[PDB]
Amino acid sequence: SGIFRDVSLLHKPTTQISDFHVATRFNDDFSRAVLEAEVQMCGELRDYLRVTVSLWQGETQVASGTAPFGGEIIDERGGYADRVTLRLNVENPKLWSAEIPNLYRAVVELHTADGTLIEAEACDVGFREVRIENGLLLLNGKPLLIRGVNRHEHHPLHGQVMDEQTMVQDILLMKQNNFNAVRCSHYPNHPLWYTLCDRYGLYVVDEANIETHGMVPMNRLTDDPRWLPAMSERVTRMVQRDRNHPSVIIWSLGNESGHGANHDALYRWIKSVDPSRPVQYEGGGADTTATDIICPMYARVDEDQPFPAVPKWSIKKWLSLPGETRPLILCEYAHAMGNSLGGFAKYWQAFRQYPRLQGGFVWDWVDQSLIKYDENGNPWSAYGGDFGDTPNDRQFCMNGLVFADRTPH
Amino acid sequence: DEANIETHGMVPMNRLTDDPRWLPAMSERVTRMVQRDRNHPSVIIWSLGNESGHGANHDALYRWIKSVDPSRPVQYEGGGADTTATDIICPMYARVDEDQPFPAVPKWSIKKWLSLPGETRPLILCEYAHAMGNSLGGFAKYWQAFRQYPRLQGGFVWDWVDQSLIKYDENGNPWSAYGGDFGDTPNDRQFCMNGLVFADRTPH
Ligand SMILES: [K+]
Ligand SMILES: [K+]
Ligand SMILES: [K+]
Ligand SMILES: [K+]
Ligand SMILES: [Mg+2]
Numbered sequence: 318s319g320i321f322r323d324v325s326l327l328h329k330p331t332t333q334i335s336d337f338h339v340a341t342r343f344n345d346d347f348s349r350a351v352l353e354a355e356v357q358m359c360g361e362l363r364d365y366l367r368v369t370v371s372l373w374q375g376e377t378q379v380a381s382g383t384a385p386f387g388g389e390i391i392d393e394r395g396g397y398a399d400r401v402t403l404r405l406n407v408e409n410p411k412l413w414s415a416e417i418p419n420l421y422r423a424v425v426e427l428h429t430a431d432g433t434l435i436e437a438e439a440c441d442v443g444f445r446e447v448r449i450e451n452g453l454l455l456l457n458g459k460p461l462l463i464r465g466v467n468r469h470e471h472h473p474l475h476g477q478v479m480d481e482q483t484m485v486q487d488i489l490l491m492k493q494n495n496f497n498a499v500r501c502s503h504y505p506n507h508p509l510w511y512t513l514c515d516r517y518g519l520y521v522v523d524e525a526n527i528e529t530h531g532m533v534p535m536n537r538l539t540d541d542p543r544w545l546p547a548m549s550e551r552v553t554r555m556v557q558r559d560r561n562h563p564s565v566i567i568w569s570l571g572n573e574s575g576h577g578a579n580h581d582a583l584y585r586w587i588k589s590v591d592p593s594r595p596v597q598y599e600g601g602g603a604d605t606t607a608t609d610i611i612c613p614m615y616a617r618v619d620e621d622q623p624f625p626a627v628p629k630w631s632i633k634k635w636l637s638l639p640g641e642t643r644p645l646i647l648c649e650y651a652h653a654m655g656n657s658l659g660g661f662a663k664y665w666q667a668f669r670q671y672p673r674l675q676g677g678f679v680w681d682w683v684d685q686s687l688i689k690y691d692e693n694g695n696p697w698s699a700y701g702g703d704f705g706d707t708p709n710d711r712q713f714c715m716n717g718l719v720f721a722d723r724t725p726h
Numbered sequence: 727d728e729a730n731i732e733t734h735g736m737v738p739m740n741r742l743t744d745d746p747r748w749l750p751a752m753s754e755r756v757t758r759m760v761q762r763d764r765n766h767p768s769v770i771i772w773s774l775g776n777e778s779g780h781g782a783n784h785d786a787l788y789r790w791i792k793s794v795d796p797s798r799p800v801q802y803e804g805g806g807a808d809t810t811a812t813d814i815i816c817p818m819y820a821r822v823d824e825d826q827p828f829p830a831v832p833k834w835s836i837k838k839w840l841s842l843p844g845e846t847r848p849l850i851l852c853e854y855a856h857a858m859g860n861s862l863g864g865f866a867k868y869w870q871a872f873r874q875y876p877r878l879q880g881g882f883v884w885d886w887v888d889q890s891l892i893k894y895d896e897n898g899n900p901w902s903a904y905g906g907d908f909g910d911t912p913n914d915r916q917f918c919m920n921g922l923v924f925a926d927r928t929p930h
Contacts, residue, residue: 451843631874633837633841634837634874636840637837637840637877638877640846642846672843
């Protein structure tokens with residue numbers, strides 16, 4: 318517990334940019350794009366106000382649009398007088414992927430018609446399209462093969478406080494070890510993580526901070542409408558924060574919370590507000606109406622595990638169940654606890670052979686061991702129970718491909 | 727029940743079945759079969775013939791049967807076993823786990839085939855487990871797959887009975903003969919014997 322991420326003060330004008338959303342849509346061969354930026358303000362509207370959105374490729378301005386406030390009519394009462402949407406044509410855009418993380422810079426200026434800046438906000442923009450078509454997850458029209466890992470935010474001295482050096486260490490080691498993707502198990506991460514993933518190139522599953530695993534049954538809260546409001550803010554406030562990062566390619570509704578009607582409501586809410594990214598969620602059997610991707614945890618390659626209600630089929634068999642058409646990407650597989658990863662090659666051979674097996678996220682990146690000191694002041698790696706915590710789950714906190722200090726297993 | 731249409735030795739295999747010249751002759755092979763046999767409850771599927779590539783004549787006759795008799799699926803394996811002229815993915819000699827990625831007409835692993843992007847049909851092999859001589863090695867691998875995968879709905883072994891013929895030696899004693907034993911040439915020798923049973927119905 319505690320105040321474990323940054324604290325800041327931000328001084329904005331009273332007439333201010335209060336939100337902006339950046340979308341990029343493409344023609345059939347990605348030779349042309351439109352960047353559409355919706356910009357919202359708070360404060361006092363004045364007829365001399367304007368917004369300009371400009372797009373930069375390094376030091377060169379490649380596109381720009383300027384308009385006064387006042388959006389299109391949307392219903393019988395008019396439109397948003399406090400919004401405007403800029404549309405920028407971009408010819409032959411450099412496309413973003415984990416392979417080549419090409420980025421542009423978008424600068425959003427709130428200014429006056431005669432040239433005075435009120436304030437500016439900005440983001441890195443990666444031109445890429447994510448869509449599911451004919452059962453395949455496509456990035457810029459090509460089917461992804463996710464070499465993923467789940468990564469919790471953990472440091473053996475600082476607990477759950479993340480810092481730039483440790484983030485960078487982790488991304489370098491991930492890419493050096495042929496990972497291209499990370500799942501934010503199981504919550505939104507420190508804001509710097511997405512900047513780093515945008516710039517170094519990793520595909521990100523951004524996951525709402527909702528896990529109710531110890532309820533019986535697992536969906537007791539997520540099926541209860543009285544919990545829809547609290548759940549809703551965990552999803553909606555994540556999308557409002559992170560929706561402009563190109564590295565985020567998939568939203569997840571949380572983890573191990575069964576499947577309840579609140580899931581279906583929030584699945585639909587994201588699909589409404591952001592059609593640019595698939596939504597996944599594994600709870601309730603991994604192939605429910607709240608997920609665009611079959612996303613099981615620890616389904617095996619050839620062996621079925623036919624549990625009541627929530628079976629984990631062989632991933633090869635799952636793809637072809639009667640009526641099923643979705644891609645399958647394991648949200649967790651290959652549990653790397655202690656001396657493990659036996660069988661890892663069997664997954665990769667299947668992922669290469671079956672178009673719709675589009676990979677998975679290993680569980681997990683780093684052991685959650687914590688440093689304690691003995692009588693002599695010498696450090697040692699501690700696990701569950703070592704702090705007098707009880708009940709505890711002992712060494713199950715260490716499931717990493719690397720030790721807590723980032724040494725490889 | 728399968729129409730008497732096979733043009734395997736054409737090059738390419740569909741040279742006649744894509745030729746509207748040959749649409750009349752093929753049409754009567756299909757239509758006169760359905761007119762004869764459509765009251766039999768044992769017929770559950772119609773087939774448009776065998777090893778004749780995939781031609782437009784197949785698509786015309788597929789839809790003729792779908793129109794006249796909605797009570798039975800139509801299948802046909804030619805042209806890669808999963809064309810627009812078949813309601814059932816019906817490959818011949820597709821293997822259980824191993825792909826054979828032939829150009830144009832690949833034989834995928836049957837487990838892979840079911841889940842190719844956009845595919846939803848059942849798969850029943852029109853021919854599998856070629857029982858020539860000392861064979862049926864790997865038979866159990868098919869059955870384990872058929873039982874594990876709902877949409878792998880089985881197959882037809884190739885085939886029931888050896889096509890050996892009886893000849894008589896200089897003493898009048900009978901012996902089983904195969905391709906070329908009648909002075910027939912060119913011939914394909916013992917390939918005519920692929921059965922689970924010998925020609926006299928003794929089991930292999
Ligand atoms: K694949
Ligand atoms: K664990
Ligand atoms: K079956
Ligand atoms: K033969
Ligand atoms: Mg300017």
